[PDB]
Amino acid sequence: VYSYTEKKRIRKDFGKRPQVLDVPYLLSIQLDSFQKFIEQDPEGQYGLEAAFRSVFPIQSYSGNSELQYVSYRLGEPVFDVQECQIRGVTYSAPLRVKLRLVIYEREAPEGTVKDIKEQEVYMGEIPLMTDNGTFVINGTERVIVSQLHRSPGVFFDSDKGKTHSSGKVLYNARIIPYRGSWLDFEFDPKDNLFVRIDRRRKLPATIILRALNYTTEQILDLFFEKVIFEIRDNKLQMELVPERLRGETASFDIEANGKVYVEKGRRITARHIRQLEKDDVKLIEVPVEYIAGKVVAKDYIDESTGELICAANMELSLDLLAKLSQSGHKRIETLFTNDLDHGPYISETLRVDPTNDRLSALVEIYRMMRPGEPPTREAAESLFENLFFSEDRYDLSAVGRMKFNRSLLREEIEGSGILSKDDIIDVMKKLIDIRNGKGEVDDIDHLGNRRIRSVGEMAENQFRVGLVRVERAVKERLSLGDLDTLMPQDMINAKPISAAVKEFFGSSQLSQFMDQNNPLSEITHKRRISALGPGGLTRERAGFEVRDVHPTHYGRVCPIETPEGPNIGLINSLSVYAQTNEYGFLETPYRKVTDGVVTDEIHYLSAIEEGNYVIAQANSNLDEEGHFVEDLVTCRSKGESSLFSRDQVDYMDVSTQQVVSVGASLIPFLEHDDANRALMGANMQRQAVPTLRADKPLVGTGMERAVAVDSGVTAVAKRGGVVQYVDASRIVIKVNEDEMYPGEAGIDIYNLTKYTRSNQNTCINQMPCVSLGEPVERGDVLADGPSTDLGELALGQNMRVAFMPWNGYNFEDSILVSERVVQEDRFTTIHIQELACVSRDTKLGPEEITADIPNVGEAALSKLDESGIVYIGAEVTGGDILVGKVTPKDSSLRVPNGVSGTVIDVQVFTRDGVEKDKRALEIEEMQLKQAKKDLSEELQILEAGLFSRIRAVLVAGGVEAEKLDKLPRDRWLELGLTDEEKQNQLEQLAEQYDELKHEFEKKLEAKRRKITQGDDLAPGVLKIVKVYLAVKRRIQPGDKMAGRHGNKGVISKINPIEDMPYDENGTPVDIVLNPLGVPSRMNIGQILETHLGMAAKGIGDKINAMLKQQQEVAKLREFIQRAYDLGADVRQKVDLSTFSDEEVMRLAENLRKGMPIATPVFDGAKEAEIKELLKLGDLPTSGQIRLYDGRTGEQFERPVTVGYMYMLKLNHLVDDKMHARSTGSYSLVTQQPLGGKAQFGGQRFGEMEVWALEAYGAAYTLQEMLTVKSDDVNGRTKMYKNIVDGNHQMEPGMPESFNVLLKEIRSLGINIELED
Amino acid sequence: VPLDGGRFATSDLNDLYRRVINRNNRLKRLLDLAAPDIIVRNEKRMLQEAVDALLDNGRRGRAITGSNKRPLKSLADMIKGKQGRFRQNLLGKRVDYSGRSVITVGPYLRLHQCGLPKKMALELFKPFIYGKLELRGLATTIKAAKKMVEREEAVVWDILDEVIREHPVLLNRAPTLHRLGIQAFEPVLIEGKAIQLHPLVCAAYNADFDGDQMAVHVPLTLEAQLEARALMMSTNNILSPANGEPIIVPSQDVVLGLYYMTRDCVNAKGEGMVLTGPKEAERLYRSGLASLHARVKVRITEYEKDANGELVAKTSLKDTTVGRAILWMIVPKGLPYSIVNQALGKKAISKMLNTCYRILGLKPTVIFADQIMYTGFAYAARSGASVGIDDMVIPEKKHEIISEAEAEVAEIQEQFQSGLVTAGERYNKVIDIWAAANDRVSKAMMDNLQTETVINRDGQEEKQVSFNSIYMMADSGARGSAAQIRQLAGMRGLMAKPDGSIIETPITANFREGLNVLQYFISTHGARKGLADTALKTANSGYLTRRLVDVAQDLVVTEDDCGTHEGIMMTPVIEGGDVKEPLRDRVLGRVTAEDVLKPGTAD
DNA sequence: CGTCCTTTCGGAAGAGATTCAGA
DNA sequence: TCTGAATCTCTTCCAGCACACATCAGGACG
RNA sequence: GAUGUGUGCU
């Protein structure tokens, strides 16, 4: 069964395999993150609760005073979204936090409080997120882009290659906290382990080990395993473990019990090791001179005199052994320092270490961190305590601790947010293990190492920054306590929190202006994962490895949707099914696979939980129970695609669309396009502008109905019902009683957003797609937004294309467009631009908006009214006056040069203390009328229902129905009836009627007072007048047109209708494209789209033929069923026998323009099915017809490819790019022409063009470029006079920018001058 | 500068100067008050830091910030860097009498013509229009003429058409990599807002028509106009300055037209007919009595200048096609007929233009290039040489080759499980057998494409070079290669990981019949490697060419002969195999240093 | 209003600055 | 135990062009 | 007017 906006035009689906999981809510990261930040969360896991519980309760310097947090709440916004956009104010909600202030008595750390007080204190007005994941900051719609940064934790890298210039790889352990200082550890070409805090400068790691309260013997115990020599009767034999001899050369005769085992010089083989273990002899004779290469572990002091014979960590020799023997040290402990496995790195580090004890190490750390100050014990101790060991300045977050414990093979993922001695020592141990040869480094770009930090987490950090500033101010204030009078508001300042939140939401690197020129642009801007921003990398200093697409991007990040140029691979787009884990890592769905059955249960596997398993490919033919057809199937185990047996797999991809984003999944026949062309197609699809009339794609993907609904442009029904009234600007739904609330049933009203301005100066405009008296259900579209067709995304128009060269008018990539395309106005767009006029109170009195403009004619003031503003609807042109403002002594707002349009809406704002202008209130008196028109309709419906209830009570107990309507409707309650509880209900209903009148009056007055608010403006201004010009841009030679397969082009000629090629039926071709654009840039998707559009339009032409001459519904039903049943084995399977013989006529009437066809991304139609569908029409199976030349009437001597391609009008218009300048205004400091098109500016003859003029030898052209039509002011007017004098000759001088350079160098202590 | 309002916009130098004067005045007041030595010492240190921040801010440890926590611009920060006085306002600068717009084709133009919008030439040439509205007596002052061109009367459009007559304009494209990126064209006024740009100069500009824009500059003075006409005219630049190669080369539609016209199919509407000249060939083709690919015998007269610059004619009866005889009507007098008596690819007509230049000079070549362009466009439009999905012909043997390669990799896996081969040997053998399979598929596809067309020769049956559309536009050199036609009809082949290691299982499909969800993800590694490469490569090549210009910027050939007996010994470069570059290319067009001795030694 | 005031995904030359290890 | 060679901090630059927004001393005592 | 941010096109 199909939805109500589905048995109206049902798109044929050529997809072949069933979707076990439907596409989720597209803008889910934004809404979920902000809901997490803004919610009332117990236990304070995340949100405002976490910040408050992490900053409060705050206390003074043990001054028996504490400000503690009780709760918080969000007040209702003073406006709604639409009024916030209209006025120019943030859609924010006040933050009312209930704090408590407790002060203790003298000598009472735990005693009774002197005074306990609590109140609700306002601090900051945090912007709210709209229902579409956007923010309204200053009347404009912004999007906070999610960020992809390195997760907190420990990362072991190598930095192989370019160190030491010897081909020796190093290794570095970097500990990145979520907030705090870094703790890099690194090696040396001499293999010495150095620590580096905050990237400052190297110093030995044993310095920080000693700073962590460790002595030399303890460090050697930690990092090395002891080998013990025993003083005995003779030769000082050593206890030996046969395992430690793995891979060494026998320094002497390895023998035990008098039996020789290994000869001198021979390699200690594994056979020797196993036979020695079988013998199980640990005490081995060792020559005395062999120990010369060993390093003592523990310090040995004398027994009698107590003097140190040998300190810890020093070499040994015969003299040292003799000095130890005369003292009688029966135990010698040395370090097992294997040259291959267990290298002596800590020993050499201790050799380089200059510090000796803890105090020396702390002083050295203080000197490194803060150079130029005399260190002290307390200062160094406090600095090292607050470096990585205080919750106030260091924080491994939950993710930091989780990754830290996972990387060290720990078990618990929870723990302390601050570092510990054990954590640092384990990091060092893991680094040493990696250096030895065991273990492996981890790649940084792996998606198990990079988090996603969305709006709900970014906004919390800035709020926390504001909170720590506030608590610092309070701690400053709480020591100066004048108690018994201080409420918890005179110490709180709401300026830091508001400043931080406003700075984050308004002016940040990720709080971007929303891309709003079709639903796809905003729906893909909200699902944008940027690697840049605060705490991330930069375009200039990003290598190629961050650019590339990792094998873990499968299902989590799109590989073919990223902008070209400076940041490619830094601004990745989220995949369709991609989700964010509880920690922030990207996880994607996978169907669980049992022993042989692909189950329907789905698990969301992240990047690290994916290499463990072997995951079946998205298209593997299961047979009705989930058994793969072959015994082998292509899979990917650990970032490696290869074949596997059927029984080995344990997961399968949910859909074939999950590898691509939501923009790349709107390309039909994506799998036939080269990935470069696919990337360009996705981007240019984002840049398409909405046309005058939306037109559905004949060759779609089935993701159009999700994008056009989840983006929020469409007016979608909230509760199902029956349409009661459809206007061009409002829809009224009478909700079914099955879905109405018991109290205050009523209706639903949808006020459509009529012609208004988007961020890109385009027109977003909703028009109804329903008709009067028509049932709708929940969640189905009622009005189509900008560039949607019946709740289905429609970015361009389907036009009849021919792939042929046509006299060189489509030479490189150009497009030859028929004149019928511009006659039909199907690419005509509407562009709305606002112009502002502000009245400020300057000196000599303020400036007013009167129409009394001096030194202008009556034709100048003809367009303005008597109030001084232009009439709504006046077709203005370049130079006309829109607003009249006078300078006391004329700064009237006038139309800029070259911009036409029609004034569609004039908008006036006034601050308090400015009385009004008649225009200013006669505007928004319409808003009052519109509010009354809704409230009165609701009142009428509710009153009619109440009076019907009254009459229905009256039909019982002596019904008097003939006399009810004769008397007016006021007195219908006290007629002849009983005095039972029904009469009590009648009196209660009369009381409710009075209550309804009073509440309608009070709510209408509330609406009027809220609309008539002061809407306080910027300081120094009086009133703002905004005038909205709307222009129609027709297609013309010069502006870009594209397809969905990366085939862009610039229109070179608008050919007449009779000059375009035509087929044997005389039908001309709309667009002529170059065939040579296909083989080179291998985008075969456009050709197959052309063929499938030809088949679809053939089906539509058959239906239109059967509908034009009237035929019975049986024939139409049979043909439409024959069209929908066509395919190999499709999943759609529509049945027209369940249609009501009237909604099949509406279906056929919607299919007469061409039957829409869905071609899912990697599960699309095939050439056999396209040819079969062409045969279902009357079209050639080859897709090529014989076209005739339009201007000579003879054949092109080849069948040419003619079809229907979906063309998009990209937002690069030619009238927005054409610019010219002879003379205009010049800059101030350097007298050069200004820049850009707004300022009447000139093109920049750059540094590289000067070289091109020098190469030619054009010395005079270059001189006139850099002197006369530039800086040189004296020789610039003489040239103008010469040119309008009949002469062409210049008197060049010196460019005024060189004199600026001379004066700026002379403003240093440098005398630069010109000689003679 | 006054910002919008009563406020005044910040200036960093004013802030630094106020900061210096504050400390200077405080120091003077302290020294007048005989303040203690430590306080005035700190004041002097603060004055020193203020002056250091004024002169060169940031050369100290921490640059001071005026507002927004960003360091403010000092005196030394507006002389250096890309935003300094040198590289922003002195080496290059914004220029009056200039504009920019999108470029379209306009294939009707000649080599020396561009098409300027009628609304852009009225703004560039505005003082020139004033100087004729004030000279024809159509205006009396500057205000009258200014308003006349403001309201755009019907009399300023013929004044403009007279100003624009022989006044060249420079057309520059933004990455001016070499000097051919600025060329001067004579303007033609057009209706529209796009600058129509001749197709033959696009190769020099490196400009397609997918949305790039050009800048028009107007030479004002007479010396500037004569430099634009005698040095920068697109007529004068038909040879590259980097090497002796032509730069006016037909490309991708002119060459497809000339390839389709000059080809032979062994059958025709008229194949036995013997024509009496090129004009009869055109008369027969246009009437539909003969095919453009016939095999006729035309009686043609060709001229040769083997005399002392004098052209002698010779008439012969040559076996050619109708198309090759139609094309002979544009080839100028002096070129041999065996320059169009073949199947003209891109190289064939590039060599035809090159030999026309060296035999007949410059003016016949400039006339010839436009004729080639027009007659290529016309006969490419007439062909209707489209592209469909049936043109990419999959070999019937592709499935068998792929199955054989699957069997061989299964055999190699069986050998590896038994332990006969190591991991690296297994990987190398699999890569080699898959490369061999890819080569076999490519060869089968190319054979089945090139010799596909079998046509009855008016007798039994015969093969010929195919008229496959995609094969024609790959063979002609118009638009295509072997690798791309292989990726369309053969198999895509072995794809590499981002690090560089080849994946041991190639893409076994191609763009005609789909790609897997995984085969398409594998392709994106090398697809985005080659896009990030070109994104990061422009910023690295620009720096190199800037340093090269600034090193060598000032050599200029100043003397005429220095009289030296030194030089270099130019010898052909030999790396061990084929000669990388012969002696003729390395020694051409250079003055010898000593007399070379013939192997008639001592002569 | 007037007016005074205070961090951290870089790679080469090259210029201090130290060390070393050698006589 | 003074000296040339090997490591150690700090400087500079990293292609060109349009176009949107934001911020420009403002906090505070008198 | 200067700077920054971001997008886009080459």
Ligand SMILES: CCC[C@@H](C)[C@H]1CC[C@H]2[C@@H]3[C@H](O)C[C@@H]4C[C@H](O)CC[C@]4(C)[C@H]3C[C@H](O)[C@]12C
């Ligand atoms: C199993 C439940 C998981 C939940 C308890 C843990 C796991 C990851 C934690 C978040 C991350 O660390 C990132 C942020 C760190 C900052 O401090 C601000 C909070 C922040 C959102 C954390 C809140 C919470 O603590 C999270 C969700």
Ligand SMILES: [Mg+2]
């Ligand atoms: Mg281009």
